[PDB]
Amino acid sequence: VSPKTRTSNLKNGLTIASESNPLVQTATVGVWIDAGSRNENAYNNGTAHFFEHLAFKGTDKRSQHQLELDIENMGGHLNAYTSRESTVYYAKSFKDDVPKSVEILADILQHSKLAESAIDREREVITRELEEVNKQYEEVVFDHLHATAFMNQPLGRTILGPRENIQTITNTELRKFITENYTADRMVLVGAGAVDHDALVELAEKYFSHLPSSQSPVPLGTPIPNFVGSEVRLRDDTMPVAHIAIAVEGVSWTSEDYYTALVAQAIIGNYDRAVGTSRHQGSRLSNIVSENNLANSFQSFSTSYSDTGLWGIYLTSENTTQIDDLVHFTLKEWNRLSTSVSNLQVERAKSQLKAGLLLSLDGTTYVAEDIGRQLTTLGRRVTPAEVEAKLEAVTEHDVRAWAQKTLYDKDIALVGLGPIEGLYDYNRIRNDMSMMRW
Template sequence: MWIDAGSRAETDENNGTAHFLEHLAFKGTSNRTQQQLELEIENMGGHLNAYTSRENTVYFAKAFNSDVPQCVDILSDILQNSKLEESAIERERDVILRESEEVEKQLEEVVFDHLHATAFQHQPLGRTILGPRQNIRDITRTELTNYIKNNYTADRMVLVGSGGVPHEKLVELAEKNFSNLPAQSPHNQAYLLSKQKADFIGSDVRVRDDQIPTANIAIAVEGVSWNDDDYYTALVAQAIVGNYDKAMGNAPHQGSKLSGFVHRNNLANSFMSFSTSYSDTG
């Protein structure tokens, strides 16, 4: 289930809510306990997971074709009937705070967060997915339920099947399991801001830490959206530039001319190219 809501649909005050909800998704519903959820998935040999990005939250299951109806029922239950118990919220709060600490040690993640923050200054796309640590400490059950009420609506959710799943059957399952969803999101301030076209701002940000022995740098230009005719062209350009890692055994022969030049002249330990697209920019 793809939901048109991530950190871009938040405010500065509740930034981190979408990711927090992802952590609580499998902690029990009004129909199933956490243990029952886990056993049900395990008994069908399936896999249940979720992830959050800046523009989407995705809850998904992998299972045999014959178990698709049961999987859709489970996803429906999770998305519409999660209990969000205070005890589970407090447990996951500690987990997310530790996750935040780990992310802060991953220099690539830190650089990309700074890149978004400066390219989309004072805009929803500039926020991080996990949110500030103070927000993680302060997020309440009310904020979590409000986020669901404001964003988990029929006009912003798409049930997707891949593999041997007949389209007509999936439509039937959607009608059966999701017919009670609110038809439309309330057009509150957070919603309206999230739908404004993002402005890419040429700028830079530099964070100095002399305890780190290397420079970790990201350079970006305004790219293309998912809907742009040049979306795949940008991905091809990314592939041509390629990636390089000095630690790899085949480092001198990793394909692109740039990789060879960097290796021969000892210019960097590694580099990667990226093309990151959103609904209206990139």
């Protein structure tokens, strides 16, 4: 039984959430923000990512060089990432360097220069990032997957934004973005590891007290996405490995089917030919794929957003003449979530997940990420006892009902990259979403 997550608020509406671990010597403190690229329109798309660069370019007090030195002197590091719905800025340090790190984070978020000279400098760095993501195949595949599934909608936009916007982002629109979005009621200060909650609350009162509150304070993790069945083919015969993602519209964080969808995902599971144990996994798809050498890997996912999600699988394969078999057998295993699954598969997947949801949190950064994610999506940290009860409530017959309304005979979003000549047209893929025998 892990120590209890303590939670306090400030007057502005900033949440402070902490989980202490007296066995470790480091601490991850940071700011989780319920805001990301999805909050941009088409004209300022890329702003959130642009700001992440300039946050480390110097403040009203410390210059870029002074900033570098201050963190070097602390001994730990700072890190940041911007997603579609979430922005994170954290600092890993020593136990007694926590007041320094909170002070630096408060500075870069509230009091950043955003000097025209630095905007102009980063504008090239970010332009170069557009031509180097091209190598990260998984990211290419998932960005096209969002673009097509949420065609012409805010969730469909990339985080980097178009080339055109990068050239036209001003300090004015940067300032406007962070003033509108980085408000106290949307922010959570998180501490995990060697942190005292009461000390962290005092540091929040000292540094984050003059944060703006939004005009209309909605609860944390408050949002209509209209999924498009569609495909993107990025054929490249010179690549040796095909990368394919297939997804349906999945579930939001607060869906009643959230846990049902996780169990369904665990029934298919993951596979990697490079891992020794993968040939012996219980998953039927794993067995088919390994015995027939159909793939190098597959990874089931159930990605959630505030008001929608994507549920599907990501495949990589060198077997270019049997892509058809790989996709065929994958979708036939999904069909069985509707037609065939019983207590045998469901109880097995529940066993595996009851541990998996706890295992994931193995370092202070993972714990902080868990507290921060849950507070910004659900408005609260869900205790392991509650999670164990929600998993236990999932029956085989919940899974069947969920798959019958979510997967069975449904439109898919499909992205193929690489030597995908063997990937059949949309209809033949989508025809495998049902079984004529059932």
